[PDB]
Amino acid sequence: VLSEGEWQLVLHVWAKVEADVAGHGQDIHIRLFKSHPETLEKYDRFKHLKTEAEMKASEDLKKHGVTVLTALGAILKKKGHHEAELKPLAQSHATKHKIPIKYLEFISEAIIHVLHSRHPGDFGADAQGAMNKALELFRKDIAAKYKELGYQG
Numbered sequence: 001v002l003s004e005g006e007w008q009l010v011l012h013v014w015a016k017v018e019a020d021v022a023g024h025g026q027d028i029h030i031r032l033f034k035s036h037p038e039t040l041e042k043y044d045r046f047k048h049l050k051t052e053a054e055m056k057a058s059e060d061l062k063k064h065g066v067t068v069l070t071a072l073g074a075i076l077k078k079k080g081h082h083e084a085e086l087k088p089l090a091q092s093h094a095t096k097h098k099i100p101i102k103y104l105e106f107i108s109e110a111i112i113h114v115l116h117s118r119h120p121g122d123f124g125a126d127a128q129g130a131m132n133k134a135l136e137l138f139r140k141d142i143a144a145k146y147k148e149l150g151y152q153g
């Protein structure tokens with residue numbers, strides 16, 4: 001559970017993300033793929049990408065990042081009351097894409113990295129802590145939904 005103050009820090013920095021969703025999405029995916037190359041294997045439509053420049057130039061990857069961040073943003077804005085938004089995500093990621101919880105941990109780390117790289121003045125220790133809690137809640141709830149569907153994290 002996050003306090004109201006923690007949710008406000010989360011949404012304050014999220015507003016910065018919303019000023020350039022595509023750009024943030026690209027940086028997050030690139031960071032994810034560079035730090036954890038095994039994750040790229042899960043994307044049949046992106047695994048052909050060989051260099052950082054190719055990744056940045058991919059319209060398809062850029063569009064996907066907007067889809068990803070739009071979904072995450074919709075979840076965060078519910079401040080924990082996110083069952084309706086989270087359920088379909090768990091369904092697809094468990095039963096179609098087969099994304100282990102550890103990979104959600106990897107992308108969470110990428111999100112923190114990119115947000116701190118771009119907005120240090122609005123993403124200090126307390127804001128990082130809040131976002132970490134929000135992403136931990138997201139992962140915890142999706143893991144529970146995974147199990148409900150018969151998929152082990």
Ligand code: HEM
Binds near residue numbers: 072099104107
């Ligand atoms: C913040 C965490 C994530 C969010 C909010 C998210 C969101 C989404 C959304 C909204 C879609 C499109 C609809 C759907 O199929 O559910 C999608 C598709 C997909 N996601 Fe995720 N995702 C996340 C993390 C991951 C991770 C870490 C991976 C891989 C390691 C992954 C792999 C995929 C794949 C392979 C697709 C299908 C892409 C395509 O071929 O069109 N997702 N994701």
